[PDB]
C-alpha cells in the first residue's frame, strides 16, 4: 500500500529551511558532547551519511556513546502500546544541545548558593518556585480625565 | 592626467572553423602555426546538429591566443589587408573588437595547393594594468565601473594609435 521506505515522508523535513543552503557552519562540529549530555535530533539534508530516520526528527535523547564522527543517543520511541528505550548512532551534524535542562541548571546553581545565604543571614526565603498567582488587589487611577465611551460600529459592507 | 591606466593589447585570439575534421582541418593548423610560431589547439563540437555534417566531440576547429609583443605584430598584418578601416559595429559593449580576414595568404603566408585557403578571425581583447584580479585564483574581484573600458573608449584608442578609420555607415 504505502511503500515502507527509509526516508519516505520527508519531502520538507530533511531539507535545509530557506536561504540557509550551501555548506554547513563549522561550529556545528566544534561542540563537545560528553556522556549524559541531553541532545535533541534535527536531521539535516546535506550530509547523507548519518541521518537517523523520520521518527527521531524533533525528539530528544541522551548521549551514551561518543566516537569520531557520531554519537550514540538513547531515545524513547512510541510504538503501539509501549515505549521503547532505543539507541541510535547519529552523525554530529544532525544534533544540537538541548537547552531544555539549561534553565534548570541555573536554578540549581543559584539555588544551592542562595540556600546558604539564608544560613548566614537567618531567614526563610522560600526558594521553591510557585505558579502565577491570582492578581493582587491593586488600585487604578483615572486622574484628570474620565473614561472613554465606546460603542459598536454599524454594519456596512 | 590619468597615469598607469592605459589601453594595451591584452590578448589576440585567432581561429579557423572548418565544417569537419580529418585532412582539411589538419593543414589548417599548419596555416595557423606559421602565423604565430606556437602550436594550435583543437576545438571540437558538443552539438550534433545533423545538417552541418557535424558530430559531437568531432574536432571542428583550431585556435590560439597571442600575447605581448607578438600580438601587436600579427595584428598589424591583419590591419593592412583590411587597410586600417573598420565599422562602428565591430566594437563590442565591452570594448574589445575583431575583424576577420579571407585568403590567409594576404597576411604573410605563401600559397600551397596541397594546403588550401582558409579565412581567419582576428579578435583583439583590450586591457589595462589591473584586469588580472578578475582571473586571479585567490582574491577574485570585479573590476569597477570607472576602470572597465567601453565601446567609445576603444574606438578613440584605435584612432589614436594605428591612425585607423571608424567608417560610421
Amino acid at each position: 500500500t504505502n511503500t515502507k521506505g527509509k526516508r519516505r515522508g520527508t519531502r520538507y523535513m530533511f531539507s535545509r529551511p530557506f536561504r540557509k543552503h550551501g555548506v554547513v557552519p563549522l561550529a556545528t562540529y566544534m561542540r563537545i558532547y560528553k556522556k549524559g549530555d541531553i541532545v535533541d535530533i534535527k536531521g539535516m539534508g546535506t550530509v547523507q551519511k548519518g541521518m537517523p530516520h523520520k521518527c527521531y526528527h524533533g525528539k530528544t535523547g541522551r548521549v551514551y556513546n561518543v566516537t569520531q564522527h557520531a554519537v550514540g543517543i538513547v531515545v524513547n520511541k512510541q510504538v503501539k502500546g509501549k515505549i521503547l528505550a532505543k539507541r541510535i548512532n547519529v552523525r554530529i551534524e544532525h544534533i544540537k544541545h538541548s537547552k531544555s535542562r539549561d534553565s534548570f541548571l541555573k536554578r540549581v546553581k543559584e539555588n544551592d548558593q542562595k540556600k546558604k545565604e539564608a544560613k548566614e543571614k537567618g531567614t526563610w526565603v522560600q526558594l521553591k518556585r510557585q505558579p502565577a498567582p491570582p492578581r493582587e488587589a491593586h488600585f487604578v487611577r483615572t486622574n484628570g480625565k474620565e473614561p472613554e465611551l465606546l460603542e459598536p460600529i454599524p454594519y456596512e459592507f | 592626467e590619468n597615469p598607469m591606466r592605459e589601453l594595451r593589447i591584452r590578448k589576440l585570439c585567432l581561429n579557423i572553423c572548418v565544417g569537419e575534421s580529418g585532412d582539411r582541418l589538419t593543414r589548417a593548423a599548419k596555416v595557423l602555426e606559421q602565423l604565430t610560431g606556437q602550436t594550435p589547439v583543437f576545438s571540437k563540437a558538443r552539438y550534433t546538429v545533423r545538417s552541418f555534417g557535424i558530430r559531437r566531440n568531432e574536432k571542428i576547429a583550431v585556435h590560439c591566443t597571442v600575447r605581448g609583443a607578438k600580438a601587436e605584430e600579427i595584428l598589424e598584418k591583419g590591419l593592412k589587408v583590411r587597410e586600417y578601416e573598420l565599422r562602428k559595429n565591430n566594437f563590442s559593449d565591452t570594448g574589445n573588437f575583431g575583424f576577420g580576414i579571407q585568403e590567409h595568404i594576404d597576411l604573410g603566408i605563401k600559397y600551397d595547393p596541397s594546403i588550401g585557403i582558409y579565412g581567419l578571425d582576428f579578435y583583439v581583447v583590450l586591457g589595462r594594468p589591473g584586469f588580472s584580479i578578475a582571473d586571479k585564483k585567490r582574491r577574485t574581484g570585479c573590476i569597477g565601473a570607472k576602470h572597465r573600458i567601453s565601446k567609445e573608449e576603444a574606438m578613440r584608442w584605435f584612432q589614436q594609435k594605428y591612425d585607423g578609420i571608424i567608417l560610421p555607415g
Binding site: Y64, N65, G72, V74, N76, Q78, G81, I83 | -
Partner: protein, 61 residues
C-alpha cells in the same frame, strides 16, 4: 467476500487500558554498544586500581 482493511479504531483505548509505561530508567545502564577501544581501556583501568593503589591511597585519604 470483501472485508474491512485497516483501522486503528479501539486500539488507542486498549493501549491506555494498562497505561503505557516509561522504560524504567534504572541507575547503571549496561555497557552494550560502547565502542571497543574505549571499553578495552576502561577495564584495564579497573583491573589495576584494586591491585596497586590502596596503600598510597588510604594515607592521602
Amino acid at each position: 467476500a470483501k472485508s474491512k482493511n485497516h483501522t486503528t479504531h479501539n486500539q488507542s483505548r486498549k493501549w491506555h487500558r494498562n497505561g503505557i509505561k516509561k522504560p524504567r530508567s534504572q541507575r547503571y545502564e549496561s555497557l552494550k554498544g560502547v565502542d571497543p577501544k574505549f571499553l578495552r581501556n576502561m577495564r584495564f583501568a579497573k583491573k589495576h586500581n584494586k591491585k596497586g593503589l590502596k596503600k598510597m591511597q588510604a594515607n592521602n585519604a
